Amino acid sequence: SIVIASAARTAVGSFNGAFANTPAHELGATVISAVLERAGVAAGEVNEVILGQVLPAGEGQNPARQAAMKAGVPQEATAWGMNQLCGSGLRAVALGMQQIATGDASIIVAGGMESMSMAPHCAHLRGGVKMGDFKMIDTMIKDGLTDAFYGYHMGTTAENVAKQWQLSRDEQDAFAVASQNKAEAAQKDGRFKDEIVPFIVKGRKGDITVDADEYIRHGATLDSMAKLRPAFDKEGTVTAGNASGLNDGAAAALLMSEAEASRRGIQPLGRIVSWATVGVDPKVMGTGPIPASRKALERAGWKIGDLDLVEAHEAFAAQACAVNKDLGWDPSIVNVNGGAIAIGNPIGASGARILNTLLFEMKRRGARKGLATLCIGGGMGVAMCIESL
């Protein structure tokens, strides 16, 4: 029953880059109107905005409610954000279908948004420290990148699956360069032009327009790639090269009944045939998507070889390949235009982000079956099946 009317994301910006001082709900707003106008639908009629956000400290009350009211959504709608780490971005889009598919609502916007750049450092000083140094905790490292279960960064969870699947530094770096090259090819030709909405960086030295993914490294050689030190495990494997950095962006989708889109002349971007989510051992968290995807395909009714296009989050090359190897889809059909390693993440958005890449790329090549999938810190994964109407 449930279709994706419209789809949009901002361009993804570098850490402390273009959007360094741009608040998440602001990037949220932009994309909220974007999917409004591209479905041809008026915020007047939006029932609820569901935004995944991971790092919300300091942005004031309920940043879902701000991004919506800003982008025109009237007061009679409702707004709530949510968090599943990387999954947030896509799971919102699942959550949103469950609203229409239960009679509980007619029309929803969903996705996520994220300013890793605007994340505050923090301290609980209600008691007041009478004597001693204290740590100013960086919520982006803490709430965003740090396993609450072992003590190490995500980067180690990668190393445990590296050693597990025995993914060598030569192969891992090979994966990286591919994703840089792919995404740089994809960029030059306007293969991202469709889904992107420009964002207007309100300024004072003038206004400056952003409609390019500033994280893709042009010319990225297998050698520049091989001159790196392992960013975590000092003779482990994971480097900056073959691992996503820290970024900002948003991405959303307007959902409605197949019967409703029909009434309005809207030519949907797809229809959500199924979604799933599963949990695993936090030490090896990147193995989320394997169980996650296959749950989806049981619910969707498809077999793995039915898939025309995959967009599987390359959080870290190591786990990216772990998903690829084990599942065994046609590798040349995953991240055709590039993975996270090259475009970045912005966590809270990373899933609606790749949903955008997926969808517009289905639309443009007559692919009919696709699936977005991502891994999760804590040890989980999410998946979604999209079949084009």
Q: Which residues in 235-254 contact a copy of itself (CB under 8 A)?
A: 246
Task: Name the residue type at position 23.
Answer: P
Q: How far apart are CA 17 and CA 346, in angstroms?
A: 13
Nearer to a copy of itself, 236 or 377 (CB): 377
SS3 184: helix
Q: What is the largest CA-CA distance in the chain?
A: 68
Please give the span between the terminal C-alpha atoms of the chain, in angstroms, as a whole number.
11
Query: CB-wise, 79 or 243, nearer to a copy of itself?
Result: 79
Residue with Cβ nearer a copy of itself (16 or 168)? 16
Minimum CB separation of residue 233 from a copy of itself in Å reads 17
Stretch that binds a copy of itself, among 27-35, 211-219, 315-323, 377-385 (CB under 8 A): 377-385
Is residue 147 within the footprint of a copy of itself (CB under 8 A)? yes
- 77: number of CA atoms within 13 Å, CB side? 26
Give, for 115, the enclosing helix (H) or strand (E): strand 108-115
Choices 15-23, 165-173, 321-329, 358-366 (CB under 8 A): range interacting with a copy of itself: 15-23
Interface with a copy of itself in residues 298-337 (CB under 8 A): 299
Total number of residues shown for the chain? 389
Cβ contact 88:346 at 8 Å: no
Pick 280 or 367: Cβ nearer a copy of itself? 280
- Segment holding 44, helix H or strand E: none
For residue 364, what are its two tokens? 């443009």
Each residue of 119-141: b (16+ CB within 10 Å) or e?
beeeeeeeeeeeeeeeeeeebbe
Closest CA to 11 of 140, 163, 194, 196: 196
CA distances 214 to 27, 181, 262, 337, Å, are 16, 14, 38, 15
166 to 205, contacts with a copy of itself by CB under 8 A? none
Among 35, 119, 323, 343, binds a copy of itself (CB under 8 A): 119
Nearest distance from C-beta of residue 214 to a copy of itself, angstroms: 17
Range 31-50, binding a copy of itself (CB under 8 A): 48
State the minimum distance, in angstroms, from the CB of residue 298 to a copy of itself: 12
To which residue do tokens 């948003």 refer? 250
- If the CB atoms of residues 145 and 304 are measured against a copy of itself, the closer one turns out to be 145
Contact residue for a copy of itself among 181, 237, 277, 287 (CB under 8 A): 277
| x-marked contacts with a copy of itself along 71-110 as a string, rule CB under 8 A | ---xxxxxxxxxxxx-xx--x---x--xx-xxxx------
Helices 346-363 and 88-100, axial angle in degrees (round to 10): 70
Q: What angle do CA 98, 101, 105 make, to 5 degrees?
A: 85
Stretch near a copy of itself under the rule CB under 8 A, chosen from 138-146, 164-172, 199-207, 311-319: 138-146
Q: Does 137 bind a copy of itself (CB under 8 A)?
A: yes
Q: Return the number of the residue (230 or 331) whose C-beta is nearest a copy of itself.
A: 230
350 near a copy of itself (CB under 8 A): no
Q: Which is it for the CA torsion 69, 72, 77, 79, positive or negative?
A: negative
Query: How many residues interact with a copy of itself (rule CB under 8 A)?
Result: 86
280 lies in the site for a copy of itself, by CB under 8 A? yes
Q: CA geometry: angle at 329 spanning 328 and 334, to 5°?
A: 125
What is the rounded CA–CA span in Å between residue 254 and residue 361? Answer: 18
> Is residue 145 at the binding interface for a copy of itself, with CB under 8 A as the rule?
yes
Return the range that interacts with a copy of itself (CB under 8 A); candidates 196-204, 225-233, 263-271, 272-280. Answer: 272-280
Judged by CB under 8 A, the chain residues 47 through 66 that form the site for a copy of itself are: 48, 56-66
CB closer to a copy of itself, 196 vs 243: 243
Is residue 268 a contact partner of residue 258, using CB atoms and an 8 Å limit? Answer: yes
What is the nearest approach in angstroms of a copy of itself to the Cβ of residue 313?
16
Radius of gyration over every alpha carbon of the chain, rounded to an integer in angstroms: 20
Binding part of the chain for a copy of itself, among 118-126, 200-208, 211-219, 310-318 by CB under 8 A, reads 118-126
Supply the minimum distance, in Å, between the C-beta of residue 304 and a copy of itself: 20
**Which residue reads 């800003």 in tokens?**
70
* Minimal distance, residue 287 CB to a copy of itself, in Å: 11
